[PDB]
């Protein structure tokens, strides 16, 4: 459902992402911006301030891990494949995360990318990423359907 | 209902945006129209192509409203009451669309404010645009 | 749906006045969520609740659409076939925000509770919430 | 939002609910727990089966806060102040969950108010619960 030019805009930016750092930034901002999400990470320790959250080692450690090898191909096009069944089960059946948070975190990642790439994160490049965040979000909510 | 820390953070972002407010408001709109094409049906009489003078002109008006909200943050209901009736009664803008443009306004700010768009300032900006949106939906 | 849920859904749906409930549900959407009026300009007077509810085009549209999901004889234990067309219509042509699919479903549920009272038990509502979520997701597929 | 006509409608509905408010509060919750199971994780210490005494008791507290809101409709922010800090700061209630309970409260009302739940009253009640939800998420 991505056109070649959307896949292009997505892959050429992702190419330049420090995947080791953007996951931590994204998760951290989620915890800081939507503080109800801290609920699901009370085992991470100190989330008491912005500085505590963004400097928390488990935050950064969890961010890097998840956002990790999600790369050459990523999201969908990984030579077929790439489904979220087991993650939907985890996030819906086990954790009971409202799927709205899947949309929020996608929006935060988009904010992170815009921050890191500035002028390069153009309106068309953003539109392409919005479809990916919508696609991922919907996939993770498959059990709520 | 914002804290003094959030007010401080919104004023810092505003200061740094400076006279680019109008330009950034244009860009936010373009970002919304491409990202969220459903929003385009509220502007059938606009050319929504890049460099459109209608989007530039409208982006200025949106910026001016946001700048007014910044300037009267403790009494936004009064500041934006007119705009609230217009969006609700005249235009009947679907409330979900405020969230869509708030997101695009945040991304625009993020793309132009590398030092200013810290997690704390991001949170404060999000709350500011949620307050604006709450007020512009208040007439439903 | 579990057999328990289909049971709850079909047993109640058997007793629905299809004619009335369609018009009722649409009318209340227009009244409760007045931004939705934007898509029904051709219907004329939607100025007050009484005008909305009494409006012939509203009640006729409600009846046409819901009249195609039965009250007995199959429909409301379907899967995923007719929704493809309606998804293209609602998303690609009308550009209805999908949130409005959940709201309308929620309105249909309010209509049902109102007409059935104590019979619309919390378990029965639960089953109807899965339906309206299932229908909402189907219609939103051209956005996904 | 809250127009005189909405205040009039909300009072009319409150009069007919009468002393059943607590009981309707309980019913709303059970409606929410069954319809929206993600909401249950906020009440691990509750027995949420039908007839639970904790759901009954929690129902009265909910209804008590809603009638407090009705009684101070013109200054809900001041009225519901502590409650907003409780749900945000301590309880970390995801704001989406206010819509879900609001919807169950509407459904409950619809199920008990044959005459009163007209289309205009439905709109007024939705607006009322949306204001309460705005206050409770304000923090
Ligand atoms: C929207 C996209 C998201 C993706 C792609 C995603 C992906 C993942 C992945 C890969 C894991 C690790 C699974 C494993 O270790 O086996 C995970 C774990 C987790 N996610 Fe997410 N996630 C997302 C959103 C969220 C959100 C919004 C929340 C909470 C608000 C959340 C909370 C968690 C938690 C608590 C865990 C750890 C579970 C555990 O170890 O027991 N996730 N996620
Ligand atoms: C922060 C949120 C918003 C602000 C501050 C804002 C501000 C404004 C202002 C100042 C105007 C008046 C322009 C004039 O006087 O000519 C206006 C008009 C309008 N707004 Fe918004 N707005 C917001 C959100 C939205 C959203 C989300 C939509 C639709 C998706 C929307 C659609 C419109 C439309 C259609 C007009 C009339 C435009 C015309 O025909 O020229 N607004 N808005
Ligand atoms: C949520 C479940 C919904 C279902 C099952 C549904 C079903 C239908 C059906 C069967 C039609 C008739 C299509 C035809 O004539 O071939 C229709 C038309 C229409 N629906 Fe919906 N609908 C839903 C929601 C909505 C919502 C939420 C809106 C607006 C906010 C909407 C706006 C319309 C409009 C404007 C038409 C007229 C299309 C035309 O004749 O030009 N629908 N819908
Ligand atoms: C109209 C909306 C709501 C109202 C009026 C309301 C009212 C209240 C009241 C009065 C209390 C007890 C305060 C006390 O005794 O100190 C409370 C506690 C609580 N509420 Fe809410 N609430 C609402 C929405 C929500 C929602 C959506 C959730 C979602 C799960 C929720 C979860 C809780 C929890 C977990 C408690 C603590 C109960 C305990 O541990 O015993 N509330 N609420
Ligand atoms: C929230 C995390 C995974 C994640 C997903 C996207 C961006 C950053 C982190 N799930 O555990
Ligand atoms: C809004 C209508 C269809 C409808 C669906 C469910 C209940 C009432 C009406 N679409 O045109
Ligand atoms: C309408 C008011 C508030 C209310 C009380 C219980 C359930 C829903 C709403 N009646 O007491």
- Ligand 2: lining residues by beta carbon, under 6 Å: B 39, 42-43, 61-62, 65-66, 83, 87, 91, 93, 97-98, 101, 132, 136
Give A129: exposed, middle or buried? Use CB within 10 Å, 0-12, 13-18, 19+: buried
Kindly give the distance from the C-alpha atom of residue A94 to the centroid of ligand 1, in angstroms, as a whole number: 11
From CA D124, how far away is CA C94, in angstroms rounded? 28
Contact between residue A141 and residue A102 where contact means Cβ atoms under 8 Å apart: yes
What number does the ligand 3 atom closest to the CA of C36 have? 30
D124 and D6 in contact (C-beta within 8 Å)?
Answer: yes
- What φ, ψ does residue C63 adopt, rounded to 5°? -70, -45
Ordered by start, the domain boundaries in chain C are 1-144
Contact B24, B112 (CB under 8 A): yes
Contact partners, residue B58, CB within 8 Å, separation at least 6: B25, B26, B29, B43, B46
Measured between alpha carbons, how far is B136 from B90 in angstroms, rounded to an integer? 12
CB A88 within 8 A of CB A139: yes
Q: Using alpha carbons, select from A113, A97, A81 the residue that is nearest to residue A40.
A: A97
- Three-point CA angle C1, C3, C5, nearest 5°: 55
H or E element in which residue D3 lies:
none
Residue B56 burial class via C-beta count within 10 angstroms: exposed 0-12, middle 13-18, buried 19 and up: middle
Q: Give dist(CA C36, CA C29) in Å, integer.
A: 7
**Is the separation of the CB atoms in C121 and C109 below 8 Å?**
no
Please spell the DSSP secondary structure of A92-115, one letter per residue: IIIS---THHHHHHHHHHHHHHHH
Q: Which residue has the tokens 């799927």?
A: A99
Residues in chain A closer than 8 A to B119 (CB atoms): 28-29, 32-33, 50, 53-54
Asked whether the CA dihedral B85, B91, B95, B101 is positive or negative, the reply is: negative
Q: Considering only CA atoms, which of A101, A99, A87, A114 is closest in space to residue A25?
A: A114
Q: Is B4:B11 a contact under the CB 8 Å cutoff?
A: no
C neighbour chains, 3+ CB pairs within 8 Å: A, B, D
Pocket of ligand 1 (CB under 6 A): A 37, 40-41, 66, 87, 90-91, 95, 97, 101-102, 105-106, 136-137, 140
The resolution, in Å, is 2.2
Query: What's the CA angle centered on A38, arms D43 and A41, to 5 degrees?
Result: 90
Burial class (CB in 10 A: 0-12, 13-18, 19+), D94: buried
Given a contact cutoff of 8 angstroms between Cβ atoms, the answer to whether D136 and C45 are in contact is no
Nearest C-alpha in B relative to D139? B1
Q: Take residue D50 and report the two structure tokens written for it.
A: 């039908």
Angle at the Cα of C47 from the Cα atoms of C46 and C53, rounded to 5 degrees? 50
Domain count, chain B: 1
Nearest residue to B140 via CA among B79, B107, B98: B98
How many Å lie between the centroid of ligand 5 and the Cα of residue B109? 23
How far, in Å, CA of D42 to CA of D38, rounded? 8
CA closest to B81 among chain D residues: D1
Phi-psi region of C45 (alpha: psi -120 to 50; beta: other; left: phi over 0): beta
Query: Is C62 in contact with C27 (CB distance < 8 Å)?
Result: yes
Treating both helix axes as pointing N-terminal to C-terminal, what angle do B21-35 and B53-71 enclose, rounded to 10 degrees? 120
**Probe ligand 4: pick from D24, D28, D46, D58, max atoms within 8 Å of CB?**
D58
Are residues C39 and C26 in contact, defined by beta-carbon separation less than 8 angstroms?
Answer: no
Experimental determination technique: X-ray
User: Gaps (C–N > 2.5 Å) in chain A: which residues precede them?
Assistant: none
Q: d(Cα B62, Cα B49) in Å, to the nearest integer?
A: 18
**Cα-to-centroid distance, A59 and ligand 5 (Å):** 10
- Which of C22, C46, C15 has the alpha carbon at shortest distance from C116? C15
Q: Which atom of ligand 5 is nearest to the CA of A30?
A: 1
**Distance of alpha carbon B8 from alpha carbon B123, whole angstroms:** 12
Nearest to B112 by CA among B11, B4, B21, B9: B21
Structure tokens, C122: 């919390």
Asked if B132 and B80 touch (Cβ cutoff 8 Å), the reply is yes
Per the listing, tokens 């549920």 go with C109
Tell whether ligand 7 has an atom less than 6 A from the beta carbon of residue D21.
Answer: yes
Question: How many CB pairs below 8 A link A and C?
Answer: 9
C67 in Cβ contact with C22 (< 8 Å):
yes
What distance in Å separates the CA atoms of residue D87 and residue D55, rounded to the nearest whole number? Answer: 17
Among residues A112, A115, A107, A114, the alpha carbon closest in space to that of A136 is found at A107
Sign of CA dihedral A100, A102, A105, A110: negative
CA distance B135 to D115: 33
Instruction: Give partners of D (≥3 CB pairs < 8 A).
Output: A, B, C
Chains that touch A (3 or more CB pairs under 8 A): B, C, D
Q: What is the dihedral of CA D125, D131, D132, D137, to 10 degrees?
A: 140
> Count of alpha carbons within 13 Å of B136, Cβ hemisphere only?
25
Please report the DSSP string for chain B in residue order. ---HHHHHHHHHHHHHHGGGHHHHHHHHHHHHHHH-GGGGGG-TTS--STT-HHHHHHHHHHHHHHHHHHHTGGGHHHHTHHHHHIIIIIS---THHHHHHHHHHHHHHHHH-TTT--HHHHHHHHHHHHHHHHHHTTT-
Whether ligand 6 lies within 6 angstroms of the CB of C105 is answered as no
State the nearest Cα–Cα gap between A98 and chain D, in angstroms.
7
Chain centre distance of CA C97: 15
Yes or no: say if A36 and A119 are a contact pair by the CB < 8 Å rule: no
Spatial distance between the Cα atoms of B84 and B139, rounded to a whole number of angstroms: 6
Ligand 3 site, residue C36, Cβ cutoff 6 A:
yes
State the smallest CA–CA distance between residue D83 and chain A in angstroms: 16
Does residue C100 have its Cβ closer than 6 Å to ligand 3? yes
Instruction: Tell me the C-alpha distance between D79 and D90, whole Å.
Output: 19
- Ligand 2: residue of B38, B54, B62 to mutate (most ligand atoms within 8 A of CB) is B62
Can you read off the two tokens belonging to residue A13?
């930016």
Instruction: Encode A55-88: b = buried (16+ Cβ within 10 Å), e = exposed.
Output: ebeebbebbbeebeebeeebbbeeeeeeebeebb
What burial letters (b/e) apply to C6-45, b meaning 16+ CB within 10 Å? bebbeebbeebebeebbbbbbbbbbbbbbbbbbbbeebee
C142: exposed, middle or buried (C-beta count within 10 Å: 0-12, 13-18, 19+)?
Answer: middle
Please state the three-class secondary structure of D57-124 as a single string: HHHHHHHHHHHHHHHCHHHHHHHCHHHHHHHHHHCCCCCHHHHHHHHHHHHHHHHHCCCCCCHHHHHH
Q: Is the CB of C65 under 6 A from ligand 3?
A: yes
Chain B residues inside the 8 Å CB shell of C35: 88, 92-95, 140
Residue C26 CA to ligand 7 center (angstroms) comes to 25
Q: Rounded to the nearest whole angstrom, what is the distance from the C-alpha of residue B85 to the centroid of ligand 4? A: 33
CB atoms within 10 A of CB A93: 11
Which position has the token pair 């109102």? C114
* Domain range enclosing B133: 1-140
Distance CA A60, CA A44 (A): 10
């Amino acid at each position: 459902h991505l056109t070649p030019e959307e896949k292009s805009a997505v892959t050429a930016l992702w190419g330049k992402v420090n995947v080791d750092e953007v996951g931590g930034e994204a998760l951290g901002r989620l915890l800081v911006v939507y503080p109800w999400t801290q609920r699901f990470f009370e085992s991470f320790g100190d989330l008491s301030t912005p500085d505590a959250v963004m400097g928390n080692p488990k935050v950064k450690a969890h961010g890097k891990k998840v956002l990790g090898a999600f790369s050459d191909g990523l999201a969908h096009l990984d030579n077929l494949k790439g489904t979220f069944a087991t993650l939907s089960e985890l996030h819906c059946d086990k954790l009971h995360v409202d799927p709205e948070n899947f949309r929020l975190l996608g929006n935060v990642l988009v904010c992170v990318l815009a921050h890191h790439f500035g002028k390069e994160f153009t309106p068309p490049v953003q539109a392409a990423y919005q479809k990916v965040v919508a696609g991922v979000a919907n996939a993770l909510a498959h059990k709520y359907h | 209902v914002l804290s003094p820390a959030d007010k401080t953070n919104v004023k810092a972002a505003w200061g740094k945006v400076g006279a680019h407010a109008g330009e950034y408001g244009a860009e936010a709109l373009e970002r919304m129209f491409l990202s969220f094409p459903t929003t385009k049906t509220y502007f059938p009489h606009f050319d929504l192509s890049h460099g459109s003078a209608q989007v530039k002109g409208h982006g200025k008006k949106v910026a001016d409203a946001l700048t007014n909200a910044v300037a009267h943050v403790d009494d936004m209901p009064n500041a934006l009451s007119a705009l609230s009736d217009l969006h609700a009664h005249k235009l009947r803008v679907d409330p979900v669309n405020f969230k869509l443009l708030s997101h695009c306004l945040l991304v625009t700010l993020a793309a132009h404010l590398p030092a200013e768009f810290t997690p704390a300032v991001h949170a404060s900006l999000d709350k500011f645009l949620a307050s604006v949106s709450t007020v512009l939906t208040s007439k439903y």
